[PDB]
Design an enzyme around this catalytic site. Structure first.
Site, mmCIF file in Angstrom:
data_model
loop_
_atom_site.group_PDB
_atom_site.id
_atom_site.type_symbol
_atom_site.label_atom_id
_atom_site.label_comp_id
_atom_site.label_asym_id
_atom_site.label_seq_id
_atom_site.Cartn_x
_atom_site.Cartn_y
_atom_site.Cartn_z
ATOM 1 N N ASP A 82 9.403 -19.354 2.317
ATOM 2 C CA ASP A 82 8.313 -18.869 3.149
ATOM 3 C C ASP A 82 8.244 -19.795 4.364
ATOM 4 O OD1 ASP A 82 5.861 -17.358 3.745
ATOM 5 O OD2 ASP A 82 4.818 -19.233 3.271
ATOM 6 N N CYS A 109 8.081 -9.256 3.812
ATOM 7 C CA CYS A 109 8.095 -10.578 3.213
ATOM 8 C C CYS A 109 6.634 -10.664 2.786
ATOM 9 C CB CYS A 109 8.499 -11.671 4.214
ATOM 10 S SG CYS A 109 7.888 -11.547 5.910
ATOM 11 N N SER A 110 5.949 -11.775 3.008
ATOM 12 C CA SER A 110 4.548 -11.804 2.600
ATOM 13 C C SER A 110 3.661 -11.161 3.674
ATOM 14 C CB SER A 110 4.088 -13.236 2.330
ATOM 15 O OG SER A 110 2.828 -13.220 1.680
ATOM 16 N N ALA A 111 3.803 -11.616 4.916
ATOM 17 C CA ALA A 111 3.024 -11.072 6.027
ATOM 18 C C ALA A 111 3.786 -9.969 6.779
ATOM 19 C CB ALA A 111 2.645 -12.191 6.989
ATOM 20 N N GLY A 112 5.102 -9.908 6.589
ATOM 21 C CA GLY A 112 5.893 -8.890 7.260
ATOM 22 C C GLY A 112 6.200 -9.175 8.723
ATOM 23 N N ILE A 113 6.268 -10.449 9.099
ATOM 24 C CA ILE A 113 6.578 -10.798 10.484
ATOM 25 C C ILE A 113 7.595 -11.929 10.663
ATOM 26 C CG2 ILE A 113 4.367 -9.955 11.371
ATOM 27 C CD1 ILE A 113 3.340 -12.814 11.428
ATOM 28 N N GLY A 114 7.591 -12.904 9.755
ATOM 29 C CA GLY A 114 8.507 -14.036 9.874
ATOM 30 C C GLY A 114 9.936 -13.754 9.446
ATOM 31 N N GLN A 168 8.204 -16.351 12.934
ATOM 32 C CA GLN A 168 7.084 -17.290 12.845
ATOM 33 C C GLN A 168 7.310 -18.759 13.190
ATOM 34 O OE1 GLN A 168 5.605 -15.833 8.818
ATOM 35 N NE2 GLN A 168 3.625 -16.118 9.842
#
Length: 298
Positions: free
Chosen positions: A180, A214-219, A261
């Site tokens: 992450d 992914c978790s937030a969908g951006i990094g 990110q």
């Protein structure tokens, strides 16, 4: 040449500045729907929302909101749906989206638990005999088989619209070793994974947009899509020097905020595209090399 710029940025150690410049120039569009009180429990992160203009709308009358964005790359001729890791209450919404958008593949770049915290709901079945049913969206999901590699797993799933009893095969590509806010172990393992997804047909125009998260969908999700688009652009023109990674990233950011990110994810993106360029430009053998260097067996 992206390589010349890479060495130039690397020598001056200005990745942080370059990355910050991207953040400053990045588009800013409203996310009114995402911020509506009724959608509070549909967002995993307060600071990561889909822009209204590019958000994916669920085909339901009750509430069509889902934290997902359609990244449509016109010049590259490829689209991707980037979304957050499903929440315990949005798993039905997630699969409803996959169904309605006619996606063939789902790319998951995170693990359910990272850094001792839950980053995503267990939205797919882990055992064949234990299928999942999402009553709210009337969908059934069954694990058909899985191919486990050292750092990624590919699962064949059967998604069924219980209303029409229509069924579809969905391929789940799970990258399990990408930290992450981090970068893959090497361009090789990342490229090996990307091409595995490509070879499956999941990124092909005959299917709906691949769903990436992914978790937030951006990094990590942004890194995956940026690399893929840059390689596709380069491939369409067979002109590596014509690809401007930063401009491509800024173009993607018109569709979803915060893609990529960290400055290191940006740097990694350059590495992936530079290395991937070898395959695109005619050295097919490099693909076997990546596979070997990735040590995917076991």
């Amino acid at each position: 040449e992206m390589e010349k710029e890479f060495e130039q940025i690397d020598k001056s150690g200005s990745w942080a500045a370059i990355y910050q410049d991207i953040r400053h120039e990045a588009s800013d569009f409203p996310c009114r729907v995402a911020k509506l009180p009724k959608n509070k429990n549909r967002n995993r992160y307060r600071d990561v929302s889909p822009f209204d203009h590019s958000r994916i709308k669920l085909h339901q009358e009750d509430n069509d909101y889902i934290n997902a964005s359609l990244i449509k790359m016109e010049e590259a001729q490829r689209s991707y749906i980037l979304t957050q890791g499903p929440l315990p209450n949005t798993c039905g919404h997630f699969w409803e989206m996959v169904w309605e958008q006619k996606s063939r593949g789902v790319v998951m770049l995170n693990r359910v638990m990272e850094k001792g915290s839950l980053k995503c709901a267990q939205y797919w079945p882990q055992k064949e005999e234990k299928e999942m049913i999402f009553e709210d969206t009337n969908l059934k999901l069954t694990l058909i088989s899985e191919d486990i590699k050292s750092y990624y797993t590919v699962r064949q799933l059967e998604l069924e619209n219980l209303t029409t009893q229509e069924t579809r095969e969905i391929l789940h590509f799970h990258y399990t070793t990408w930290p992450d806010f981090g970068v893959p172990e090497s361009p090789a393992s990342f490229l090996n994974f990307l091409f595995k997804v490509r070879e499956s047909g999941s990124l092909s125009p005959e299917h709906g947009p691949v769903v990436v998260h992914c978790s937030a969908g951006i990094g990590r999700s942004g890194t995956f899509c940026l690399a893929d688009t840059c390689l596709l652009l380069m491939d369409k023109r067979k002109d590596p020097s014509s690809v401007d990674i930063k401009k491509v990233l800024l173009e993607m950011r018109k569709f979803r905020m915060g893609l990529i990110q960290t400055a290191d994810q940006l740097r990694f993106s350059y590495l992936a595209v530079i290395e991937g360029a070898k395959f695109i430009m005619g050295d097919s053998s490099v693909q076997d090399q990546w596979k070997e260097l990735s040590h995917e067996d076991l």
